[PDB]
Amino acid sequence: TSLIASGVHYHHPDGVLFLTQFTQVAMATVAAAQVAEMREQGAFVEGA
Amino acid sequence: DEMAAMLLDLCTVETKVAAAGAPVKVDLTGGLGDIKIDMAELAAKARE
């Protein structure tokens, strides 16, 4: 719900995962990890 | 009636939001904490 960080304090009544400073980080890591797996299986085409 | 009023004041919008951010510990005591009154006597004798 709430989180205190280094210099900043983030509070949401619902969730912090839906807060942008987090949400963007979560979304970026989720996709970056999924592609890495796709790359490990070689499913990534050279001309994409 | 006095103590009831003290309990409602914790239920006010101001102190409600305070509880949402972090647990609120309220002392509703009348200063019985720094009391130097000896309970071995003034309580027992009262009861006796």
Side-chain angles (χ1 to χ4, degrees):
Chain A
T1 34
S2 62
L3 185 99
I4 165 180
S6 65
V8 284
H9 193 76
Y10 298 141
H11 59 285
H12 186 191
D14 297 336
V16 323
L17 181 58
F18 298 165
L19 295 179
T20 68
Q21 344 88 13
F22 305 137
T23 277
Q24 295 185 29
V25 170
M27 178 64 62
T29 316
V30 160
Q34 187 63 37
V35 179
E37 182 186 11
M38 292 289 296
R39 185 178 178 180
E40 286 299 322
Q41 297 296 330
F44 194 88
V45 285
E46 194 178 3
Chain B
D1 291 335
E2 282 174 335
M3 265 302 308
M6 299 297 290
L7 296 160
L8 303 165
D9 297 334
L10 316 183
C11 304
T12 55
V13 184
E14 310 175 18
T15 53
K16 283 180 59 177
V17 182
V24 180
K25 179 174 182 177
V26 189
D27 192 272
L28 302 174
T29 331
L32 297 166
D34 46 335
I35 268 199
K36 292 137 186 173
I37 281 186
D38 299 329
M39 301 260 72
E41 294 185 358
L42 296 193
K45 293 179 179 179
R47 186 179 185 179
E48 289 166 11

Short mmCIF file of all heavy atoms in Angstrom, two decimals, chain A residues 1-5 8-12 15-29:
data_model
loop_
_atom_site.label_atom_id
_atom_site.label_comp_id
_atom_site.label_asym_id
_atom_site.label_seq_id
_atom_site.Cartn_x
_atom_site.Cartn_y
_atom_site.Cartn_z
N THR A 1 0.84 -1.20 0.00
CA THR A 1 0.00 0.00 0.00
C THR A 1 0.87 1.25 0.00
O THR A 1 0.81 2.07 -0.92
CB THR A 1 -0.89 0.06 1.26
OG1 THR A 1 -0.17 -0.51 2.37
CG2 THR A 1 -2.20 -0.70 1.07
N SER A 2 1.66 1.41 1.06
CA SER A 2 2.62 2.50 1.16
C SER A 2 4.05 1.98 1.06
O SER A 2 4.33 0.82 1.39
CB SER A 2 2.44 3.28 2.47
OG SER A 2 2.68 2.46 3.60
N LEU A 3 4.95 2.82 0.57
CA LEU A 3 6.36 2.47 0.58
C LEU A 3 7.18 3.72 0.79
O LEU A 3 6.88 4.78 0.23
CB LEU A 3 6.76 1.78 -0.72
CG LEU A 3 8.21 1.29 -0.69
CD1 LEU A 3 8.28 -0.19 -0.37
CD2 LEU A 3 8.94 1.58 -1.99
N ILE A 4 8.21 3.63 1.61
CA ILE A 4 9.14 4.72 1.74
C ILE A 4 10.44 4.30 1.08
O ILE A 4 10.96 3.21 1.32
CB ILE A 4 9.39 5.12 3.20
CG1 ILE A 4 10.63 6.01 3.30
CG2 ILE A 4 9.53 3.87 4.06
CD1 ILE A 4 10.97 6.45 4.71
N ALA A 5 10.97 5.18 0.24
CA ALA A 5 12.19 4.91 -0.50
C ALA A 5 13.26 5.86 0.01
O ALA A 5 13.06 6.51 1.03
CB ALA A 5 11.97 5.11 -1.97
N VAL A 8 12.12 9.52 -1.11
CA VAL A 8 10.72 9.71 -1.46
C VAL A 8 9.78 8.79 -0.70
O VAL A 8 10.16 7.70 -0.28
CB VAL A 8 10.52 9.51 -2.97
CG1 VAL A 8 11.02 10.72 -3.73
CG2 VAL A 8 11.24 8.27 -3.43
N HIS A 9 8.54 9.25 -0.53
CA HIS A 9 7.51 8.49 0.16
C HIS A 9 6.29 8.30 -0.74
O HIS A 9 5.62 9.26 -1.13
CB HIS A 9 7.12 9.22 1.45
CG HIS A 9 6.30 8.39 2.40
ND1 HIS A 9 6.85 7.40 3.19
CD2 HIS A 9 4.98 8.43 2.69
CE1 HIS A 9 5.90 6.86 3.92
NE2 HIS A 9 4.75 7.46 3.64
N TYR A 10 6.01 7.05 -1.08
CA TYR A 10 4.90 6.74 -1.97
C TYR A 10 3.79 6.02 -1.23
O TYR A 10 4.01 4.95 -0.64
CB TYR A 10 5.39 5.89 -3.14
CG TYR A 10 6.42 6.58 -4.01
CD1 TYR A 10 7.50 5.88 -4.53
CD2 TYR A 10 6.31 7.93 -4.31
CE1 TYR A 10 8.44 6.50 -5.32
CE2 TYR A 10 7.25 8.56 -5.10
CZ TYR A 10 8.32 7.84 -5.60
OH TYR A 10 9.26 8.46 -6.39
N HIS A 11 2.60 6.60 -1.24
CA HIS A 11 1.44 5.97 -0.63
C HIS A 11 0.28 5.84 -1.62
O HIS A 11 -0.07 6.79 -2.31
CB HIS A 11 1.00 6.75 0.61
CG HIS A 11 0.63 8.17 0.34
ND1 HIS A 11 1.57 9.15 0.10
CD2 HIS A 11 -0.58 8.78 0.27
CE1 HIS A 11 0.96 10.31 -0.10
NE2 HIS A 11 -0.34 10.11 -0.01
N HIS A 12 -0.30 4.65 -1.68
CA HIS A 12 -1.49 4.40 -2.50
C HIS A 12 -2.45 3.60 -1.63
O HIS A 12 -2.02 2.71 -0.89
CB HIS A 12 -1.07 3.61 -3.75
CG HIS A 12 -2.16 3.41 -4.75
ND1 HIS A 12 -2.02 2.54 -5.83
CD2 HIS A 12 -3.39 3.95 -4.88
CE1 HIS A 12 -3.12 2.56 -6.55
NE2 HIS A 12 -3.97 3.41 -6.00
N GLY A 15 -2.60 -0.13 -4.33
CA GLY A 15 -1.33 -0.81 -4.48
C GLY A 15 -0.19 0.03 -5.03
O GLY A 15 -0.41 0.97 -5.81
N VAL A 16 1.03 -0.33 -4.65
CA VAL A 16 2.21 0.38 -5.10
C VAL A 16 2.62 -0.14 -6.47
O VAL A 16 3.30 0.55 -7.24
CB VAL A 16 3.36 0.20 -4.08
CG1 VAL A 16 2.82 0.21 -2.68
CG2 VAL A 16 4.08 -1.10 -4.30
N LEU A 17 2.17 -1.35 -6.80
CA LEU A 17 2.51 -1.96 -8.08
C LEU A 17 1.82 -1.19 -9.18
O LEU A 17 2.24 -1.21 -10.34
CB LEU A 17 2.06 -3.42 -8.10
CG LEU A 17 2.37 -4.22 -9.36
CD1 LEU A 17 3.86 -4.23 -9.64
CD2 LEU A 17 1.85 -5.63 -9.20
N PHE A 18 0.75 -0.50 -8.80
CA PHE A 18 -0.01 0.32 -9.73
C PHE A 18 0.46 1.77 -9.68
O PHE A 18 -0.08 2.63 -10.37
CB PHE A 18 -1.51 0.20 -9.43
CG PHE A 18 -2.05 -1.20 -9.60
CD1 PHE A 18 -3.29 -1.55 -9.08
CD2 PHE A 18 -1.32 -2.16 -10.28
CE1 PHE A 18 -3.78 -2.83 -9.24
CE2 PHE A 18 -1.81 -3.44 -10.44
CZ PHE A 18 -3.04 -3.78 -9.92
N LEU A 19 1.49 2.04 -8.87
CA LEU A 19 2.15 3.34 -8.89
C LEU A 19 3.25 3.33 -9.95
O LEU A 19 4.01 2.37 -10.06
CB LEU A 19 2.73 3.68 -7.51
CG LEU A 19 1.72 3.88 -6.37
CD1 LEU A 19 2.43 4.19 -5.06
CD2 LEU A 19 0.73 4.98 -6.72
N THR A 20 3.33 4.42 -10.72
CA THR A 20 4.15 4.47 -11.93
C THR A 20 5.65 4.26 -11.72
O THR A 20 6.32 3.65 -12.55
CB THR A 20 3.93 5.78 -12.71
OG1 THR A 20 4.45 6.88 -11.96
CG2 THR A 20 2.45 5.99 -12.97
N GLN A 21 6.18 4.78 -10.61
CA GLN A 21 7.61 4.63 -10.31
C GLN A 21 7.97 3.15 -10.18
O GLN A 21 9.10 2.74 -10.42
CB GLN A 21 7.97 5.38 -9.03
CG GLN A 21 6.93 6.39 -8.57
CD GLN A 21 5.86 5.77 -7.68
OE1 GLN A 21 6.02 4.65 -7.19
NE2 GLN A 21 4.78 6.51 -7.45
N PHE A 22 6.97 2.36 -9.80
CA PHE A 22 7.09 0.92 -9.65
C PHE A 22 6.58 0.21 -10.90
O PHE A 22 7.30 -0.59 -11.51
CB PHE A 22 6.34 0.45 -8.40
CG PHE A 22 6.78 1.16 -7.16
CD1 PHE A 22 5.86 1.61 -6.23
CD2 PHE A 22 8.12 1.42 -6.94
CE1 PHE A 22 6.26 2.27 -5.10
CE2 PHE A 22 8.54 2.08 -5.80
CZ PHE A 22 7.60 2.51 -4.88
N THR A 23 5.33 0.49 -11.25
CA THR A 23 4.65 -0.11 -12.40
C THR A 23 5.51 -0.16 -13.67
O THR A 23 5.58 -1.19 -14.34
CB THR A 23 3.37 0.68 -12.74
OG1 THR A 23 2.30 0.24 -11.91
CG2 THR A 23 2.98 0.51 -14.20
N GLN A 24 6.17 0.95 -13.98
CA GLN A 24 7.03 1.01 -15.16
C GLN A 24 8.20 0.05 -14.99
O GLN A 24 8.59 -0.64 -15.93
CB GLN A 24 7.54 2.43 -15.39
CG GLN A 24 6.45 3.43 -15.74
CD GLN A 24 7.01 4.80 -16.07
OE1 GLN A 24 8.13 4.92 -16.55
NE2 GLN A 24 6.23 5.84 -15.79
N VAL A 25 8.76 0.01 -13.78
CA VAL A 25 9.87 -0.88 -13.47
C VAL A 25 9.45 -2.34 -13.58
O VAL A 25 10.16 -3.16 -14.15
CB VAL A 25 10.42 -0.60 -12.06
CG1 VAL A 25 11.42 -1.67 -11.65
CG2 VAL A 25 11.06 0.77 -12.00
N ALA A 26 8.28 -2.65 -13.02
CA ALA A 26 7.74 -4.01 -13.08
C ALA A 26 7.49 -4.44 -14.52
O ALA A 26 7.92 -5.51 -14.93
CB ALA A 26 6.45 -4.09 -12.27
N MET A 27 6.81 -3.59 -15.28
CA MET A 27 6.49 -3.87 -16.67
C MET A 27 7.74 -4.08 -17.52
O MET A 27 7.78 -4.99 -18.36
CB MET A 27 5.65 -2.74 -17.26
CG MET A 27 5.29 -2.92 -18.73
SD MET A 27 4.25 -4.36 -19.02
CE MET A 27 2.79 -3.91 -18.09
N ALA A 28 8.75 -3.25 -17.29
CA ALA A 28 9.99 -3.32 -18.06
C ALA A 28 10.76 -4.61 -17.78
O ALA A 28 11.32 -5.22 -18.69
CB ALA A 28 10.86 -2.11 -17.77
N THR A 29 10.78 -5.02 -16.52
CA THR A 29 11.52 -6.21 -16.12
C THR A 29 10.81 -7.48 -16.57
O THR A 29 11.44 -8.45 -16.98
CB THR A 29 11.73 -6.27 -14.60
OG1 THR A 29 12.13 -4.98 -14.12
CG2 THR A 29 12.80 -7.29 -14.24
#
